[PDB]
Amino acid sequence: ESEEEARRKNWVDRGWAPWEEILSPEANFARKSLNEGEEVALQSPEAIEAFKMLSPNYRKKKISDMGITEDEYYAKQFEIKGEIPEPLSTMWAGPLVVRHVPPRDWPPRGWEVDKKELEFIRETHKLQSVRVDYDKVEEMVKMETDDMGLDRYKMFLKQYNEWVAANKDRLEKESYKYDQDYYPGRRKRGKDYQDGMYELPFYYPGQICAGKVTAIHLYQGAFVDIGGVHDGWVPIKRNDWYWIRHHIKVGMHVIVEILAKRDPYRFRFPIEMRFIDPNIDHLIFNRFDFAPIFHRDEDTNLDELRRDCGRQPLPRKDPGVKVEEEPLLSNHPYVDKLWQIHNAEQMILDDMEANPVKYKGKNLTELTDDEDFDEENRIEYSKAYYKKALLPKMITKVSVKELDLEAAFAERQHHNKLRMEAQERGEVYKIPKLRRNIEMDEYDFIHWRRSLEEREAMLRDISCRRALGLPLEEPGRYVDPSAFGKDQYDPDSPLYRYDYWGEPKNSEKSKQERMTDVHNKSIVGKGTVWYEMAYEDAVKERMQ
Amino acid sequence: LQSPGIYYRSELDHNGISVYTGTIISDWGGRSELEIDRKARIWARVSRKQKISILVLSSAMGLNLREILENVCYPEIFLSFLFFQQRCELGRIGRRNMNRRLNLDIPQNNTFLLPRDILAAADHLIGLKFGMGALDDMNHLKNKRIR
Amino acid sequence: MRTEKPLEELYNVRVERNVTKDRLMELGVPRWSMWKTGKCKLPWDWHVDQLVYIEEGEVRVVPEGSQRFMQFVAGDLVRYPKWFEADLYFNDFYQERYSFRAYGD
Amino acid sequence: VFAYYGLKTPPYKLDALEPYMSQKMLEVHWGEHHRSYVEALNKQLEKNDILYGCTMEELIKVTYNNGNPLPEFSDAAQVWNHDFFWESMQPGGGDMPKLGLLQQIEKDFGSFTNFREKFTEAALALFGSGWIWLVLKREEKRLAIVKTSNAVNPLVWNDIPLIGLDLWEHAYYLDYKNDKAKYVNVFMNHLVSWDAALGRMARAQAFVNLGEPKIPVA
Amino acid sequence: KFELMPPPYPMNALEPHMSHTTFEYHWGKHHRAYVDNLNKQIDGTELDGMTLEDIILITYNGDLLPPFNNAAQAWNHQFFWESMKPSGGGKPSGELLQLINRDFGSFEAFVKEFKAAAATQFGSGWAWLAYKANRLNVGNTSNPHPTDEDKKLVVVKTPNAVNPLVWDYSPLLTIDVWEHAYYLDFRNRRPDYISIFMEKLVSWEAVSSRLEVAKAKAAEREEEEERKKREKEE
């Protein structure tokens, strides 16, 4: 492409800027001497001048030839070249008519005040909706003072004075504890803190304030002192400071407008403002999308940080399944916990029936099996179990403190007495179900009903949201279907896996042999299977 | 002895730009080169002829033409351009060397020459043709293996 | 940090403590479903709203990846938001009255 | 106890648009429909003090809650929405845009006639109650026509609105019973305010820059 | 195709409460438009003659397909007219009362609920009374312990143009809370309109008629399910 087009592209995307690049004499001579050639006589005038300027006496004579002081040359070294913009002018739109209104968020979280005073203070928010005609303002000007009504505002001030005297030491201690080094935007502490500075609650978005510029950062922006404990920040990015630096200088008195107030703990710059008097809205092209935050050590969950700051959610992989086109859930968490204690009770009852000597002499109502049971050591896992194969194992220390053996004893003593007489009658007795199984089935049923109600509500929720134009899924989470990428894909077609080349369908490892071996050993014969059906089908055929 | 992998030797050419030939060494000792003339002229030296139709070789591997032109970087020159016994059987060190020289993240368990390997090889060769690349030295001990 | 930002409002989980029975019968609490559980752990992802009126015990809700939990006493009406991922840790006997509500009341 | 507790009377009088919108209709929309909204917003803000100390543009976004609106989102949105609407109309009529807005429309929508055609199409294509908006997208730096739901406003997507119309029936039922296309045509011919839209675009230019930088020759 | 069907009541002085004008615009103009529009678009489609009620379900497709809206609004508009009889109001008599009494406590409980639900609808919408005789089509839909009293009468609020048919509930009674209906008459005093409807205009018998149709629908479904059980067994 063309040079102009290329420079345009760079300015737009990369951020190129032709800075001054103040050089030494030895270097200036190097930059203005290598353009001709090597060991060749210097014919250019600037090259000869740079060669002569390598001597200190030559420079101290040339500075006196033009009549400049010793500091004048050093000041002229750091001079901005190129075209300088015209001095900006301040064109005020019209009369500025304002009114002191207390902040809407004045009482901080955790500070209780009298209700009637807060009511009389908040009463002023209703009066802000009235309109004022700006043109006729001059006509109604009254120079006589002592007639203005500011009781509400005064009341706010009264409350404020109390709150600062109450919480100044606490705020300073928190600033010293959480913030280590001072930076433009943090709380003024130590020698920089003078009594009488407006604290952070005083301010509120929408207030015009006058201040002076005290800091200028290339990447962050300008910092204006508004006479408060926290400085103000005007977002100006890196590339705009090529033209904005001619209009904004350190120590300039400026008029700003507060547009947002944030928490100083999470956000680096609590007060962000815009310029009113030096209006430079035509030179800002790069802007911040989200306000800067602190990634501290206390916050360990990124979701809490995202919800506190207000940014988008962490993106995840896009699932191909639909929330409506999927089966329900019919597995209750208490199923395992009840099944294990039920099996434990059955086994203990069987062991007591087998050896009545141990069961005799002790009351069946209360049986102290083990007095060393610990809730912390209830979960014990040992992978040394290799009776049949090398595999891990777990041990569960069931407590007899909550085992309901009262009804279980009666149930077993009623069931065995009937099964024995059924066996004596020439019949085989198969117990259909027990009470614990009925309770587990009831738990499964209520959980299934909960899931059914959830999906019945979801079927109506999807409809209405679709109708009224509302997001069905949380925006910002499933936005990338496969933008996250380059993962090895098992699938051959992605080329992340092999495909036949010259008929190379051969597969490394993936031995089906090991599997074949366990199948072959038990049932080597390659006979044709006759009966083939699922276990549920087998139960259905058995019950039929 | 040398280790399996890609080396990207820049053979000096008498006419035109220097021909960049990349040799892929296998575990057994096979050699498969890829040449670059003044034009794209992406050909292989596996066949007896000078031009082995690297495009037809990549198409016969089983990859779709659209995915082939979409995966490789700089698809303009790719669109303008119009064995399994020992070559594909790369060793354990060959996969590591190919993942180190190139930018692939294929797991170490895979020891077969995937079509993505040839795609990335052609991409790096056509990039080196434009000046984005670095040659390799076969005398370096990192390129040699000790039995 | 001296946290003035509890998890009841960070995650939009509106909890009304010590609710009066007239508002309960105005909403329809007794004419709802039932759910009973002892000491368990129920990982659940919400798809719709849920007004939970706990009846018997206590439930400690732990959001995904978090180390701080929120506790609900037996006399609270909790409204779990949409797209909520948490892990309800139960400790003792628990009963509730729930009614999943779609967009709107 | 109550913030934003004010109907914020329109710039013009209730009988300024009488030849097109009767003075009774305006009285009802502003007097009854709007007033009510404010009262309920005040009653809801009295209960929750955290959402009380927040600006309108921030309150709307914090009550939208990214798809799962809080029970007070609809009301505040309506109050803001209505305010924008009254001011989005001016006494007299609107013939054509001015220096900046007309140029931006010609750059974005091609021409002003195509803009009017697309606006009328989007207004008639809406189903049910809702609003139609002429907004300025920040990251794209262009003007677009977006149609929304009952109370949702473009502030939830960080877009600066310039002109809006109330497609809720309460607005048109009294003078134009069921000819909604007529109501649109009247609003676009003799009720649209281009000076207000130009002023709002001038205000938005402090947040989104519509222009090209001055690149040095170096 | 589908054509406007006149209101059962005279729709002139049938209701002094609802003006003829209101009827003329709501039904004469708005209902007509919906049906006409449907006719204009359904023409030559696969759904040339399919019953509108079936056409609705087909066009709901999550993604509402182009004609769903017109169709639904038309259907719903006709349910409304049916719902109101000329002189009207009173208490349900017959079996409805029993169901109502079991499901919600008293008539005075359903009345409060219906009135409240209608008021809280925001924007255009309808209010519905329905029988919960639905059945899912994914997974473990079938109920173990199937019991009577699992079917219930429910109050459902709906957004503009969506009818409980889409979710397979049983439509019984409806109010058009969309504004076209009451503005002219009450100038935005929506609660009043709701109240008048539930006092002077509700013919509970009309809904009771539909009630029993629905009970039989449910029965026929489970009888067909029994038939299926027989098939797989024998």
Place this chain on the structure above:
Amino acid sequence: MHWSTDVYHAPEFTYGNVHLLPKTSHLWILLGRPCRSSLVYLSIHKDQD
């Protein structure tokens, strides 16, 4: 990297990173610690954090 002047903005090749120099100039390397962040990290890790 950084260059003020005396460097061609348009690259010599269409798909390369090579930039020729018309005159003598200084190339600067602004010191910093580079990092490689995925799409998940860029959701919270933003500018001036």
Place this chain on the structure above:
Amino acid sequence: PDPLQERDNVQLRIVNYILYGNGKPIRGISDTSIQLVRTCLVLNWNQDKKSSSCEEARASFVEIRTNGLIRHFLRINLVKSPISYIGKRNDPSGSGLLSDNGSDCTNINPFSSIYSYSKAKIQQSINQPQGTIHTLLNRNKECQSLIILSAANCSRMGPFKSLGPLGTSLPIENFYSSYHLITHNQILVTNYLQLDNLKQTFQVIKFKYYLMDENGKIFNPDPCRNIILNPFNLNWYFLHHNYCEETSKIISLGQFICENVCIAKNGPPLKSGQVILVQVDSIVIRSAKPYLATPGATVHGHYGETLYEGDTLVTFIYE
């Protein structure tokens, strides 16, 4: 038997095949009778249509240890290859297999004293680079990279040698007038505002401050002069923002400063870098290093790319 069955992915089938092949009778032992028909049970997981899936199950046994007794129960779990679950309701978290994993500190019960002690046992994390995250505008099209600017890259030059809220703008009755923007911009005023002030004569007054009380009365000591009422003291004080003074700095923002420039005989601008921050009494310089390139050389890279250590920057062709 269970009335409600979950839609599990494990499909257990029973296969019964003939022992011997048809047509060939094997010898029958006198002691042991032959088994004509046999049956077996197999466990096979669901197989996807796109790719064949196998039952990657795990076998483990659990024993109920109570009252000095043991039980024999075997459990099989068809664990999927990806540990990540599509939804949280379908999580496999409700299980425990191995206690070897100890790195899962997050699994500490909050009710135990160990959870409270871990807050102090785990000190403040300093493994992070501890720097300002500096994004790349040039790398926005490609994979976005990050530069961590810290104290090792930035230095500070030591020697180098009323205010407050005014008010809140009230709503304006004549919205038609462009009074909403408090001040116009000299460059953009030719777009949103007609040249009325150019044809007419603008007022010589610049700043007009009118303060309205809660009762709706405009009060100001001077009719239209610049007098500001400060909030804390409610005392009318002049701004005097101009003060007949101009502030300028010799070192401007963005200037690259080499070494041996000798701006002052006391402190030299070390680190040969760019001025990123300008204060009233100090200057912050980001470290940089210049490279001299001859005409005809080639710079490998774009403007703001990341150059790792040991990367080719400039290629010189020399004899």
